[PDB]
Short mmCIF file of all heavy atoms in Angstrom, two decimals:
data_model
loop_
_atom_site.label_atom_id
_atom_site.label_comp_id
_atom_site.label_asym_id
_atom_site.label_seq_id
_atom_site.Cartn_x
_atom_site.Cartn_y
_atom_site.Cartn_z
N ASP A 14 -83.49 41.31 -72.16
CA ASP A 14 -83.78 42.13 -73.43
C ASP A 14 -84.62 41.62 -74.44
O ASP A 14 -84.80 42.38 -75.56
CB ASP A 14 -82.36 42.63 -74.02
CG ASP A 14 -81.62 41.53 -74.73
OD1 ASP A 14 -82.12 40.31 -74.68
OD2 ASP A 14 -80.59 41.82 -75.44
N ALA A 20 -81.88 25.33 -75.10
CA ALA A 20 -81.02 24.78 -74.02
C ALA A 20 -81.15 23.26 -74.15
O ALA A 20 -82.16 22.85 -74.70
CB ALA A 20 -81.54 25.31 -72.75
N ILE A 39 -66.07 27.14 -75.38
CA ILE A 39 -66.09 27.99 -76.58
C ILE A 39 -66.61 27.34 -77.87
O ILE A 39 -66.76 27.80 -78.89
CB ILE A 39 -64.75 28.58 -77.07
CG1 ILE A 39 -63.80 27.41 -77.54
CG2 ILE A 39 -64.22 29.47 -76.00
CD1 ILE A 39 -62.62 28.03 -78.28
N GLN A 56 -75.73 12.18 -60.73
CA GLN A 56 -75.34 12.68 -59.32
C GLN A 56 -76.44 13.24 -58.49
O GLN A 56 -76.28 13.84 -57.46
CB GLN A 56 -74.21 13.66 -59.33
CG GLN A 56 -72.98 13.11 -59.78
CD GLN A 56 -72.48 12.10 -58.70
OE1 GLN A 56 -72.06 11.05 -58.95
NE2 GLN A 56 -72.57 12.57 -57.42
N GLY A 57 -77.72 13.26 -59.06
CA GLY A 57 -78.79 13.76 -58.33
C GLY A 57 -79.40 15.15 -58.62
O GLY A 57 -80.05 15.73 -57.81
N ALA A 70 -75.41 32.84 -83.67
CA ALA A 70 -75.82 31.69 -84.65
C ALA A 70 -76.30 30.60 -83.82
O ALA A 70 -75.64 29.84 -83.24
CB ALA A 70 -74.50 31.16 -85.28
N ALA A 92 -66.01 37.34 -80.92
CA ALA A 92 -67.11 38.14 -81.02
C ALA A 92 -68.21 38.13 -79.91
O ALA A 92 -69.26 38.91 -79.87
CB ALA A 92 -67.81 37.74 -82.39
N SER A 115 -87.91 21.38 -59.92
CA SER A 115 -87.00 22.16 -59.08
C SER A 115 -87.34 22.16 -57.55
O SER A 115 -88.32 22.45 -57.12
CB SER A 115 -87.02 23.67 -59.55
OG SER A 115 -86.86 23.82 -60.86
N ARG A 142 -74.79 28.88 -55.66
CA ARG A 142 -73.33 28.47 -55.55
C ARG A 142 -72.95 28.42 -57.08
O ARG A 142 -73.64 28.00 -57.88
CB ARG A 142 -73.09 27.00 -54.95
CG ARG A 142 -73.43 27.10 -53.47
CD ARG A 142 -72.97 25.90 -52.74
NE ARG A 142 -73.35 26.02 -51.40
CZ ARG A 142 -72.55 25.48 -50.33
NH1 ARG A 142 -71.54 24.72 -50.63
NH2 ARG A 142 -73.02 25.84 -49.03
N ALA A 143 -71.70 28.84 -57.28
CA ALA A 143 -71.08 28.93 -58.62
C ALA A 143 -69.82 28.19 -58.78
O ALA A 143 -68.96 28.41 -57.85
CB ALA A 143 -70.93 30.34 -59.08
N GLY A 148 -61.52 29.59 -66.30
CA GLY A 148 -61.98 30.74 -67.09
C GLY A 148 -60.69 31.51 -67.49
O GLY A 148 -59.68 31.45 -66.85
N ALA A 219 -58.77 16.17 -63.18
CA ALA A 219 -60.26 16.24 -63.55
C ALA A 219 -61.02 15.59 -62.35
O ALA A 219 -62.09 16.14 -61.92
CB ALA A 219 -60.52 15.38 -64.84
#
Side-chain angles (χ1 to χ4, degrees):
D14 73 353
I39 63 166
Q56 295 288 135
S115 315
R142 291 192 181 209

